[model samples]
Target chain A: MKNSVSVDLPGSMKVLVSKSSNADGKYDLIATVDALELSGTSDKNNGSGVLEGVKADASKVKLTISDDLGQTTLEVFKSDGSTLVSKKVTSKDKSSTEEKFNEKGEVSEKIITRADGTRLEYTGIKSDGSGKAKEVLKGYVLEGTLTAEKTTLVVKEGTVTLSKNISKSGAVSVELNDTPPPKKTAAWNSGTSTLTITVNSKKTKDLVFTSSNTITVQQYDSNGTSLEGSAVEITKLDEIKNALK
Target chain B: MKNSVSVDLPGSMKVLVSKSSNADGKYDLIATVDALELSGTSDKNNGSGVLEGVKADASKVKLTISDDLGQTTLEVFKSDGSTLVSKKVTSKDKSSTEEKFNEKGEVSEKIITRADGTRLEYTGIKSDGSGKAKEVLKGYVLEGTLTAEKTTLVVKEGTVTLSKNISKSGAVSVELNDTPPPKKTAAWNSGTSTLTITVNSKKTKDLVFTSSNTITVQQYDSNGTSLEGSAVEITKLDEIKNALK
Candidate 1:
């Protein structure tokens, strides 16, 4: 009898990628930022010689803005819209532009004199004190508020009406398009919220509003809380816009 | 401050076949078998007249042939070259053929009479028996032989020649046609004990004997044996057939 032994060997490795989220802080998954841009400005200088001097000196005033884990350099300007200074900054840096804080611990307006040394004025503050100082200056803002919501409702055989109120300062518009259509007409309450209509699941009409007002509604459930994150099915945004006429 | 950690996951496994001896031994290495067959015979008749009332029984004769780790089988015949019995066998099972051996550890020849009651004659053995025999046969003789030879020579200009004498029987002589070309022919006489030739490195040549005794010269190595797991080249019958020119 011949004694022989044999063995089998294995080969290459495989890989896989998985994505997940945690509701609690137990697993702090790090998400990578693929792209970023910033935009917007708070103040404008309108004065004369003093503003020009401030603008010239402002070009040397380095401003550093920082977040929890990110930082960027900002060029501070004295009212007349002239660059003050440019500097590099990171999220961990403790440096910031020289600007006085208000009672709310927020930076107030940046002051600058006229170019002819006429009147001393601040350019960043709003007279009504409703707007906050700009955090980003004139490019494209990288981060903004992201809201996603969904709602379900029951309606009878006739027609059900739903309304939403949108209040935004900058350019804002609502879009409506049909998933499938039979067509219904929607009504809007300009004094209140935008209204949408659904006709027994056969057709839907959408109304969108783009005004700068705090929206409120009287419709509620047993708890008397506003229904949010509701979306109305519509045929098209142009149809809804034309229907508003 | 947040602490971060990273880890690499295991990848998929792969299978690699290497010419090196250290490669994983999962492959089934099969050596080519040139000559062999497996068969058996039984005896069940009485040694008497066909119409006689004399009742006699003959015992069944059983035979098996086996070989060492590497051995070929041959047919057993009478003194006149008439086959008494023939069986197929492999190098791993050539010893089990009982009809090929006797109690005194020699070849035994069995008798097989024709339907006319005439005994047949057998002449020579079937297989060459140069290698170690796995089993001892009684009246029969091993008819074939196998030889493995090696040589070393210095190669000049990337080519060298190896010539050897081989004696074969039968009118159809083994020829070299697909012999692997020598890579560095000068090292034909190196004292290396292990013989290995890379597959597909050169054409396979067959070594054909012109006469009963002929000198066979064929290339074995094409590239020099500088690789760590390089094998000393050896020529086979197929290589001889391929190299026949």
Candidate 2:
């Protein structure tokens, strides 16, 4: 039998633990961002957490760490591990590139963080496998906190769709539009704390007011019939949004 | 010096590595969902792929994984790991719950896959630390594929906000709304693939067409002076969308 549990952390982070075992005591364990495509082991019979090793080699940027518990945690210097860094990483096939730019947009700097609080720094930038200029990396010790959040919404009915979002600072926004020939109308009212939108030849009117947590939509058909529809009628719409988005 | 890099992967997944070090060779490493709060060690001195150990204990669900390379990937049983599981995982403080219901909404199921392709199944449900019916687990070894994706857009202009999304199935949507009153008009022309929206008194006409990747917006203030505005002017708008949302 196999089972998994998840724990929510502050800063839009989560910890999910999944364990599976056959009639045999032998088991495998793994840690992935969100999927269970790996394997690891757990001494549920005698221990607390699942333990597994990991190895990845892309762009000749080989990386490996020990499986000891002392190596599970990190301590960053002068960082809460929440600083948003303007960086990008791209990898395909057997090649990967980790690029961090300086004030002048050049690949220079050291130390970076992961959502899991994993830290690595700049070791060198070279080309291998695909022979592309890829950045090589090392590791770091850190002590701090981590956070992440979601602030967006999407609703679909027939060919019409609605998008909405609330910023981290509580700023709210909404948008309305359709498929191709993508023509949409958007507006805001800071004073009234309201948002209004019209779409599809102006026959359908959808509304989302901050006054209520629900979305108020008033749609119309070609014949001016009150085309009322509920696309987001799932009992877990909010919960699902918070999780997937 | 602190630097980091990110790699985009299929299934809307990402691999990020951050490294930090002092003049001395001693360093730390970590892997977070999107933050650098933990630590791990890398052998830039010799290796391929950053490896780190991870341990998360919440709700009496203690989880530990070793740092072995073979455990970095996973496989599912008769699944693609992309099957949207009708499941929910919630945790707070020291407790977490992973629940998957059957068609009758009862928590009874076995075998689940994660975004990283790590698959787990039903073990046993019981009460632990918090004395709540938390789930106890173990681990699994498997082989298969995994995938995930994204489909949404949001734009902010002055007091107005616009949102757009293209479904993995190729369906597109857009929404517009203001602050509180949330009075908006939305419409769609599947025949023309056009989505039109007007918000904040309809004086603001924002348009998105399916034929183009760009959004056309026109606005007029209280005086009817063609108010032209540009909010999504970032060079990495598409890239950012694929990365963040």
Candidate 3:
């Protein structure tokens, strides 16, 4: 038998034992340290399992990392210790995936952006309706040679529609063709420019992106089989622009 | 007194004073558990002061976080209880200071780079050491009658040589004179490319790059300033090109 003595209490605490009556041995504890800390491990022997509690905080992401990357949940707290947000995050040693896209309309380029500045890039070009892009051939038919200032560009019929101009350098393009005033609506686009023109090889000028970030503009009409008005003696530059209607 | 049972124990277990040797009041310890857990706090923290032992082992970064973020030391150990790597880490709750970069160069334009893309914009003129760029005028001479496929421009010295070309709309802006090469070779850049030639602009062409990413190319010389045999009858374009030596 072990002699027992009594003591006064200033604080509360508990001790460990397997049986309250009789046991194999006895032990006692008295702590007077100014500070103390406790920690456990899913990382003790085999070093794996649910880590039991999540760990992270500090100036530079100090980690008490276990080699086992197990799935876990994390809870963020506000200053008063109330839960601010709870999220489930899974970590892996490393990983990656692949993907592809199919375009139905005009094919340009494909851009897949990820979090941060990461992205996947590839170009897939194919379509049901297609045509050849060729040099303006002979016998395309022409009314005569069209002149802009001192340079004359002979107009080829049918092939001389605004379709080619819209596809070319993107000029004479804009409020200039609101159907109400093709050739007559000139002075309008000279300044606040509803039209975009590339000034140098720097296409930064003509590439106007809409909210969706694609390069497109001005819907020209080719709906009618023939133009609304018969061809007039188009002598000026604006006069030739209106002839496309 | 209650009862006393003598038991066998090692001297290493009795370094502290016996709890059973003194008394003020009654006490009892009753526990039923497989494992006993011991803990303390540098947290929940009555948060300050020296902490008693039990720092860490194997893969873990242990710290005594303080309300006062100041200097501290740490020790790392192996599972066998041997020291592996040991060092000190310090922390700061907050801190700032000032910075500056004064440039001394051609002072062309300030280059601003972000993750999106890059652009070379200009005030479009030179500086006297200088001002916001105004018109590029005077003594800069362009007095040649320029002829291209469709345009012939009779140069008006100083007012503009490429004026007729800009109107024709865009013509001969090819040959100027150069001694070395621009911009450092000095006079060599006169015929090089401060003379802007448009390959394909509505306002355009692979364009070229300048230190300048925009897509411009270098126009190499015939190697000598006065040509190999003074000057060749520039019949073939290469003949003229070779004559530039």
Candidate 4:
């Protein structure tokens, strides 16, 4: 016959130990005791309960369980290589329910926890009486440790309108009128990667770029972005003389 | 036997008769007549002896002597098969001595005429006391006839000089100086086959020609034979520019 023991435990202990056990060693047992005084306490408290099992190692008895505990580990080892004498255990613990909140802390939907210790929340889009769409919150705040590893945000498609006029000679200047001057208007389409600029009547002449010539583009949100500058060499007059003639 | 008839002779003749033989068919006779009895007077009686041979009809004669006078029927035939004839009496009647004269009209040499009408004269260079030389002329001029022919002269060597400075830029200007400036001076030998005017301290930069510039060399002689507007072209300026640099 095995010695029986009964130990009063706290709510935390109830999470670690089973509620019921038979006096036989084949059945599970539950108890709580001080860390030191295993055999001595067993004798003092009388052989009516097994306080030695809990008092011998309090660190080994603390445990909590939930549906979100996806994995666990147990290690059994002996003082020597052949006989097993002690055991160690560990587990990955998580909350079983997800957090839910609406506009102004109103309850919206059920919350759930993932195996990776991530909390998932759900919210529904609200609609006005006129069947128009509306956002429940004007903005949102994320409160957590966000580790943005090397991630790239790409703009796959967008439209950009240039306000200045680009001359045929790549001479860029500002246009004052509502209608861009025929000689100054140009379009740079990113979809086709093409630039079309208005040219002067004399197409044969070289496009002379002056201090007024400039190029402007939309700034990217990313830091450390830059635009490269280019140079244009002056064409010799004699070379063009023959082509003109 | 005596044979006498009173028929008149062609010209004036006086008849004298004397019978010496009494034979009816043959008689010995002697007759003599004086010129006072002849009515014709002699023309210009310079006592030249009469010709002994006379005949009523014209006769041809072959003489042993070949003299200019003996060649009466002078005939000349050209290479083109044309004949020329001259009918004039030649002087074969008398034998006379010939004479020569110097330019000073002094009797210089004597010649003797032979029976064949050939004459020999003496010609020699005479030295005066002052060592001046004189030429003696032999030969006579009976009929003054002279002939003329054409002649040519030859030239062997000469020099030509430039009257102007020829710029490689095709600007030719006359040299104002009496002599060309020294080679180390402003205008030196600057171009090959083309005359490149050196700028010389950038003072004459405008006058310096670029590639393909040409200058005409106005050539002249001491006798003023000038080529006024001839020209030469400059096909390259690299050599000139390199030298200037």
State the displacement of the C-alpha of residue A29, model 1, in Å, after optimal TM-score superposition.
Answer: 47
Worst lDDT 10-window in candidate 2 chain B: B129-138
Task: Give the least accurate 10-residue stretch of model 4 chain B, judged by summed lDDT.
Answer: B150-159
Residues B109-204 of candidate 1: C-alpha lDDT, one tens digit per residue: 333222222222222323333332111112222122223331111111111111111223311111111122323101111232111222334422
Q: What is the interface RMSD of each candidate, in Å?
A: 47.1, 22.3, 25.7, 39.1
What tens digits encode model 3's per-residue C-alpha lDDT throughout A1-245? 13322221112211111122223332221211112121222222222222122233411111122234332222223333333332223233221122222332233333323222232232332343222222121212111121222111222222111111111231211100101111111111323322232212221112112222112233222441222333223222232123212
Taken over the whole model, the C-alpha lDDT of each candidate is: 0.25, 0.33, 0.23, 0.25
* DockQ score of the complex predicted as candidate 4: 0.00
What is each candidate's DockQ, to 2 decimals? 0.00, 0.03, 0.00, 0.00
What is the alpha-carbon lDDT of model 4 when measured against the actual structure? 0.25
| Model 2 lDDT at residue A80 | 27
Q: Mind giving the per-residue lDDT tens digits that candidate 1 earns over A1-245?
A: 01211211111111111122224412111111111112222121110000011232333233222222233343444444442322222222233323343434344544222222222122344434433222121221111221122111111111211111112332222111112223333344445445443333422333332232111222223332344445433333233233322
lDDT of 3 by residue, B1-245 (tens): 13322221111110111124224332211111112111223222122222223433333222232444342223233343343333233333221111111223233332212122211112221344222211111212222222223222222222112121211342222211112111111121222222122211211111121221111223433332221222212122232122122
lDDT (C-alpha) at residue A121 in model 4? 32
Off by over 4 Å in 2: A1-245, B1-26, B30-39, B43-51, B54-166, B173-245
- Per-residue lDDT over B10-58 for candidate 2, one digit per residue giving the tens place of the 0 to 100 score: 2222334445444666333333422223243554321123333222321
Put down candidate 4 lDDT per residue, B103-136, tens digits, no spaces. 4544344343434443322224132311111111
Q: Of models 1 and 3, which has the larger lDDT?
A: 1
